[PDB]
């Protein structure tokens, strides 16, 4: 169908584009634009990136007037999928910007990784619960998200401290991880994921 990839936020978003592009390839009838304002009408698969602060990413999502936009997909059934800053930005708040309110569309909080030797930087595996490939991608973060058990898609350890690398409720998926960055076994990733919101 439709997929959208906001286009705001913090980074710079056409690695991911890119990839998306490139893994919507075997399949057809799949359109890709770029999300800077509500003007525009529901996607099939919503995509909010970032890499940034927890801060920033929810301030270039009000200032664009995006926030009621991903709400409105979520209560619509869509998919929508955070990636990197972006997962984060699905809970409701984090300790890298106090106050400051995630879209708080996955219950649960965003706090600081344990390890003395921050950011988080590298590849590690991320062990999924199902329908993903297990393997490893590539991680650049600071924080990790907290959330129940019910919601944890996938895991992955640094530094003795094992975090959720993915999470998952309903039609919204989160990744801490680049896909676009992950190779094979992120276009794989990228794939099953249109793959999933192709069907339903």
């Known amino acids: 169908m439709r997929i959208g990839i906001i286009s705001v936020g913090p980074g710079n978003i056409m690695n991911l584009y890119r990839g998306v592009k490139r893994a919507s390839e075997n399949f057809e009838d799949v359109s890709i634009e770029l999300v800077e304002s509500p003007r525009n ?5 919503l995509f909010i990136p970032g890499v940034g602060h927890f801060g920033e990413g929810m301030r270039r999502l009000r200032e664009n007037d995006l926030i009621d936009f991903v709400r409105k997909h979520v209560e ?18 984090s300790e890298e910007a106090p106050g400051v309110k995630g879209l708080s569309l996955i219950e649960g909080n965003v706090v600081k990784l344990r390890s003395r030797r921050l950011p988080h930087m590298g590849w590690n595996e991320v062990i999924f619960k199902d329908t993903f490939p ?16 019910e919601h944890v898609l996938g895991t992955t350890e640094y530094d003795g401290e094992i975090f959720p690398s993915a999470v998952r409720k309903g039609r919204i998926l989160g990744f801490q991880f680049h896909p676009e960055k992950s190779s094979k076994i992120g276009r794989k990733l990228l794939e099953k994921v249109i793959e999933c919101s192709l069907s339903r």
């Open 76 to 93: 619509d059934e869509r998919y929508v999928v955070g990636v990197c800053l972006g997962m984060q930005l699905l809970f409701e708040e």
């Open 41 to 45: 009408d529901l996607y099939d698969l």
């Open 134 to 149: 297990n393997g490893y991608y590539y991680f650049v973060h600071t924080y990790r998200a907290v959330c129940e058990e």
